[PDB]
Structure 1
Amino acid sequence: TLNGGITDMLTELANFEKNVSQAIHKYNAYRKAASVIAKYPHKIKSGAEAKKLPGVGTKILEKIDEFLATGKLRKLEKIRQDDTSSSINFLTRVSGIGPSAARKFVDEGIKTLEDLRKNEDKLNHHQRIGLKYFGDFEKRIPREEMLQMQDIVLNEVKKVDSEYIATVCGSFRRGAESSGDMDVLLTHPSFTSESTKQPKLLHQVVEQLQKVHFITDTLSKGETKFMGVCQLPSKNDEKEYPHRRIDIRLIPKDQYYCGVLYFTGSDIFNKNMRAHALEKGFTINEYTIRPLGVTGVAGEPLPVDSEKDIFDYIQWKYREPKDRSE
């Protein structure tokens, strides 16, 4: 990419602030700056040129000047040589190990993949599975495999109850030629903002996908959100496909458009759009868009009949899913 060196450096800084410093707003600031630089259609010549972009300030401009002049950033080169920072950044790559648990493990002398496997009994369930599939979860999914996965989910869901509608969101819905995992929005007419007329609506789908050995493991599971592991079937004498993360979100059928806007993302696009809503006097979640009163208290849900209605309320021109990859 045009500015890949700069955006990589900002991403590494973001991950430092999140995993090591536990400064969530610094993390989002670095990610927002990397995003706006990622879509800037010129090869950046200076920090001052970049500071013109929203989300790039004085400090990142200076880092950009250091990186443009030397090809590196001293702050990162020192971070890379710090053993505690190295340890924590590695452990937080296991699903279920966040900043706090990573620092606690380092305190207990658990700092490597070998240490983690030595101490499985010190892991909760999510972490145990994240460690089990550590290699697999860092692999990307070709869109072709995403299409085979889509076919299985959609047909198995239709076998449970043909009134379900399952929609693959995330980067897949944004047209990506590869995805890091599969995100499935699910609706059923028995589950609306008004009533739940049928129980186990998510569970029944999960059970069916386990029964056919597509879903292989469960990280967390509630009434509306499943987070787990899945695997494509391989052919005779074929090497197995990697295991993949899968997220399934059951959304009230009448709130599908807010739900699919949320689950299509990206995460940064959602942050930018929800921040814009607030400046416009609305708050958006995966269910509703609502006005804010002078109170600052959210009012009653506004009528929504398309993703575009959401954009219109906040005075944004519509953006197709493929233009939301911020």
Structure 2
Amino acid sequence: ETLNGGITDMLVELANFEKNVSQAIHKYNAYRKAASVIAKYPHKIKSGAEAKKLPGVGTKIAEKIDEFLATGKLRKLEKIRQDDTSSSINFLTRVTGIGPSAARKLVDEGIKTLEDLRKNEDKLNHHQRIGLKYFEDFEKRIPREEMLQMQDIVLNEVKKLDPEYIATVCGSFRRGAESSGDMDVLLTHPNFTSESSKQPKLLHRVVEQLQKVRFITDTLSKGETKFMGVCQLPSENEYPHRRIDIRLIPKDQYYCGVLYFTGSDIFNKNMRAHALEKGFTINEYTIRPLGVTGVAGEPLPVDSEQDIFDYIQWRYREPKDRSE
């Protein structure tokens, strides 16, 4: 099935390499986009030119296409499976924390294995230190069952501190993903707003106790409106440490709150995208009119997600659908 696949597949690879292997954001942007548009198309893309017809995709993209069309490969593409350097780079990116810049440097010092990484860890930054530490786990996804469990675990101590703490795990969860990547938890409490501005400690508390109780083990960031971290389940003799994150909002904006944290990357963007077009710019905070002159306006009334899409003249989508 799904016809224009191979090609798309092929397409993206390119992008990341250009993304990663080079900065070439621009090429990567295009590439990605190009991958997209090709997939949304409904016919067997025979002639790579046919494709060319198709908007966005251009001449060189166009080229890579037929190469593939003739024979299942692009040497450029093969180079990756060939050139050490780059193959190396990709790995590192597999590491949480280590993004390309740092990744390069790491190779630039011949650091080019997981093992290597260990060997002179000394060069890493903590965040990275932790990644390496945990590496293995991070590959394995979190199964819904646990996710549920975890969820609870949270809910408890949360409310225990103060009843008035809204907790809501979102992201993949809201999208009914049989397996999710990490705990994406939203948070709120009745006094906090655009007009209270402070109290971040509330955030600080949950974790505080979360840490105390023996949940979050590790701490990647303890910012005032956000927290990234690691945790893991309790045992009887073991399970993987899971990434975790919590974010707290000014209750008054709760709605963008669910929106963003849920969304699905692309999803949010589309919207956010559509929005600008429609005279607004959304945020995980608010939606405001783009007062033509440029100016983001005074926050829009948001009693539910609905309002948003509505505002945007877009049909509401219910979470599990959200994927695009």
TM-score (structure 1 length as normaliser): 0.89
- In structure 2, runs of 5+ residues without a counterpart are none
Partner of 1:282: 280
Distance 1:149 1:20 in 2: 37
| Change beyond 3 A, Cα 1:147–1:280 | same
| Alignment check: 8 A CA contact 1:32 1:268 kept | no
Q: CA deviation at 1:244?
A: 1.3
Q: CA deviation at 1:46?
A: 5.9
Q: CA deviation at 1:234?
A: 2.8
| Change beyond 3 A, Cα 1:58–1:223 | same
SS at match of 2:136: helix
| Change beyond 3 A, Cα 1:156–1:15 | farther
| Change beyond 3 A, Cα 1:304–1:72 | same
Higher relative contact order, chain-length normalized (CA < 8 Å, sep 6+): 1
| Alignment check: 8 A CA contact 1:262 1:270 kept | yes
| Change beyond 3 A, Cα 1:39–1:225 | farther
Listed one character per residue, the Cα deviations across residues 95-124 of structure 1 (whole Å, up to 9, x for unaligned) are 111111111111222121122101121111
| Change beyond 3 A, Cα 1:29–1:306 | farther
- The answer to which of 169-178 and 294-303 deviates more is 294-303
- The answer to which of 33-42 and 251-260 deviates more is 33-42
Partner of 2:207: 206
Q: CA deviation at 1:313?
A: 1.5
| Alignment check: 8 A CA contact 2:291 2:297 kept | yes
| Change beyond 3 A, Cα 1:308–1:25 | farther
Q: CA deviation at 1:42?
A: 7.2
| Alignment check: 8 A CA contact 1:190 1:198 kept | no
| Alignment check: 8 A CA contact 2:263 2:322 kept | yes
Q: How many residues align?
A: 323
Distance 1:168 1:54 in 2: 38
SS at match of 1:234: coil
Distance 1:52 1:235 in 2: 61
| Change beyond 3 A, Cα 1:270–1:64 | farther
Q: CA RMSD in A?
A: 2.4
- The answer to which of 279-288 and 81-90 deviates more is 81-90
- Asked if 1:23 is matched to 2:24, the reply is yes
Distance 1:199 1:300 in 2: 24
TM-score (structure 2 length as normaliser): 0.90
Distance 1:203 1:88 in 2: 36
| Change beyond 3 A, Cα 1:73–1:179 | farther
Q: CA deviation at 1:64?
A: 4.1
Q: CA deviation at 1:80?
A: 2.7
Q: CA deviation at 1:132?
A: 0.7
Listed one character per residue, the Cα deviations across residues 232-260 of structure 1 (whole Å, up to 9, x for unaligned) are 22334xxx111111111111101011111
Identity %: 96
Q: CA deviation at 1:71?
A: 2.9
- In structure 1, runs of 5+ residues without a counterpart are none
Distance 1:145 1:281 in 2: 42
Distance 1:162 1:49 in 2: 60
| Change beyond 3 A, Cα 1:305–1:38 | farther
| Change beyond 3 A, Cα 1:28–1:324 | farther
| Change beyond 3 A, Cα 1:78–1:167 | same
How do residues 48-67 of structure 1 correspond to structure 2 at under 5 angstroms?
Answer: 56-67=57-68
Listed one character per residue, the Cα deviations across residues 3-62 of structure 1 (whole Å, up to 9, x for unaligned) are 554443333223212222123344344444445556767776665676677765554454
